[PDB]
């Protein structure tokens, strides 16, 4: 791989420079190189991996949605035939998006999850596994779709089980996992009641634990609690 000759610390340093420059494709390539050195990632390094790939796949998902909507307007009654180009270009962006998700999933499987023993690393990686299967599910239409949805659900569920045994209800990883699994239920699994129940229980259990926190921890937890309440406001 093209980063094989670069020191691990230099890859981390350049990932941070790439973030500052809003060069997220470079950031992701640097962090892939760092993971492929074979050492476990620190907390900060796990968050650089997540920021890089979330920005890359976020642009692809936004593009895919725009193209899918145009392809939808084209298959309506009265719409002029314009040829294969919209489908072809949606397919090109879809394939690229699937490739990024497969790359992240492959890093998690080789070998980040198997080496992750502490709750804060293992939950973080299992959440990421759920997230990138969720992004695959957003574009899935084939014989595959049920198994991709179940892979997302399974990863999220294992992360949830660990988080509820090992982390306080205010832990930001635990909160963001619950937030994302609730969105999985709403947007992917056709389970809006499950989505709403999880968001409300998560919010209420975090509320009750805020008294234990420092000012800085309180700010970290309440930021994600607000996202839970924003979804509940949208959904109810």
């Amino acid at each position: 791989g093209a980063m094989g000759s670069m020191e691990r610390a230099s890859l981390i340093q350049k990932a941070k420079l790439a973030e500052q420059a809003e060069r997220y494709e470079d950031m992701a390539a640097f962090m892939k190189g760092a993971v492929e050195k074979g050492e476990e990632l620190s907390c900060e390094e796990r968050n650089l991996l997540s920021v890089a790939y979330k920005n890359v796949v976020g642009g692809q998902r936004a593009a895919w949605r725009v193209l899918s909507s145009i392809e939808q307007k084209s298959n309506e009654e009265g719409s002029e035939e314009k040829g294969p180009e919209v489908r072809e270009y949606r397919e090109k962006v879809e394939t690229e998006l699937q490739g990024v998700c497969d790359t992240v999933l492959g890093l998690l499987d080789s070998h980040l999850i198997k080496e992750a023993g502490d709750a804060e690393s293992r939950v973080f990686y299992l959440k990421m596994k759920g997230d990138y299967y969720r992004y695959l599910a957003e574009v899935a239409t084939g014989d595959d779709k049920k198994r991709i949805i179940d892979s997302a659900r399974s990863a999220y569920q294992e992360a949830m089980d660990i988080s509820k045994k090992e982390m306080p209800p205010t832990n930001p990883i635990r909160l963001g996992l619950a937030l994302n699994f609730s969105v999985f239920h709403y947007e992917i699994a056709n389970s809006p009641e499950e989505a709403i129940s999880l968001a409300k229980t998560t919010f209420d259990e975090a509320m009750a634990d805020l008294h234990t926190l420092s000012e800085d921890s309180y700010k970290d937890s309440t930021l994600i609690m607000q996202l839970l309440r924003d979804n509940l406001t949208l959904w109810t």
């Binding site: 997540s50 920021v51 994302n180 969105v183 709403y186 994600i224 924003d230």
Partner: peptide, 7 residues
């Protein structure tokens, strides 16, 4: 339009 976790 669902809010997911911020990176």
């Amino acid at each position: 339009n669902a809010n997911s976790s911020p990176v």
